[PDB]
Amino acid sequence: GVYSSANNCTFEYVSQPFLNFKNLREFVFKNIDGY
Amino acid sequence: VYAWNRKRISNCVADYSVLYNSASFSTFKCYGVSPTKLNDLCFTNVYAD
Ligand SMILES: *[C@@H]1O[C@H](CO)[C@@H](O)[C@H](O)[C@H]1NC(C)=O
């Protein structure tokens, strides 16, 4: 349960899965020049 | 024609030479761009009606 509707799509991309505490996951998200 | 299908084409490589070199099309009239340079240019989205 995360959304109720999806009306106008512009981009879809399906890829391979990225994934005591045993795992450390670091991510960096950047928005530069529309990238 | 009243309910014409619109398909949005994105995130892929569009090979226009296959369409241009086909002899199966009676009309291939391009407005605003030429067929020769279509295979080189890049566009944000393609609307196929
Ligand atoms: C966005 O969606 C609404 C309803 O789902 C529609 O009326 C509108 O034309 C759409 N706009 C675009 C740019 O797709």
Q: Count the residues in chain A.
A: 35
What distance in Å separates the CA atoms of residue B35 and residue B28, rounded to the nearest whole number? Answer: 9
Calculate how far, in angstroms, residue A9's C-alpha sits from the geometric centre of ligand 1: 9
Q: Could you write out the DSSP letters of every residue in A10-32? A: -----------------------
Helix (H) or strand (E) holding B8: strand B7-9
Rg of the Cα atoms in chain A: 15
Burial class (CB within 10 angstroms; exposed 0-12, middle 13-18, buried 19+) of B34: exposed
CA angle, corner B45, sides to B44 and B49, nearest 5?
160
Angular region, B32: left φ>0, alpha ψ -120 to 50, beta rest:
left
- Name the residue of A5, A7, A9 whose CB sits within 8 Å of the most ligand 1 atoms, as the mutation to test its pocket: A7
- The protein residue whose alpha carbon is closest to atom 12 in ligand 1 is A8
